[PDB]
Design a protein around this ligand. Structure first.
Ligand SMILES: Cc1cn([C@H]2C[C@H](OP(=O)(O)O)[C@@H](COP(=O)(O)O)O2)c(=O)[nH]c1=O
Ligand SMILES: [Ca+2]
Length: 129
């Protein structure tokens, strides 16, 4: 896999971000993760965590996996990095998302994320509390 530049337009919630990608606006849904909806426990927390990338980071990059690049809603499907840190991984590590939506073909970072989830679970963090 390879990382490509993009520009943050708006972080929407915990696992959805709108980016300018090759000059066109696209809503990206983060691969392999599920944050609570905003109306559920830890939804607001995950939303603020991801939103914080606007203030807390400088360089945003997208990395597609080897399978489908768009979902049936027209959203991009990718791993998103902020100053080199994977947002997907960070959300799972903090117990703000669960590993989810795992499809063969788009699961390159599955084991990486499951490691993060196991730590967050052991610590009884947030979702796991
Ligand atoms: C992360 C991911 C989500 N999705 C789709 C399936 C879910 O739609 P359905 O329930 O209609 O199948 C939806 C979950 O998105 P949200 O978690 O953003 O609501 O996104 C994919 O199709 N592939 C993916 O890799
Ligand atoms: Ca969600």
């Amino acid at each position: 896999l390879h990382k490509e530049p993009a520009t943050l337009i708006k972080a929407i919630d915990g696992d959805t971000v709108k980016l300018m990608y090759k000059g066109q606006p696209m809503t990206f849904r983060l691969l392999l993760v599920d944050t609570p909806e905003f109306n559920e426990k830890y939804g607001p927390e995950a939303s603020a965590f991801t939103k914080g990338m606007k203030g807390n980071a400088k360089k945003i990059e997208v990395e597609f996996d080897k399978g489908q690049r768009t979902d049936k809603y027209g959203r991009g499907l990718a791993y998103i990095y902020a100053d080199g840190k994977m947002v997907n991984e960070a959300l799972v590590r903090q117990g703000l998302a669960k590993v989810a939506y795992v499809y063969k073909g788009n699961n390159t970072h599955e084991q990486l994320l499951r490691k993060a989830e196991a730590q967050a679970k052991k610590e009884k963090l947030n979702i796991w509390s």
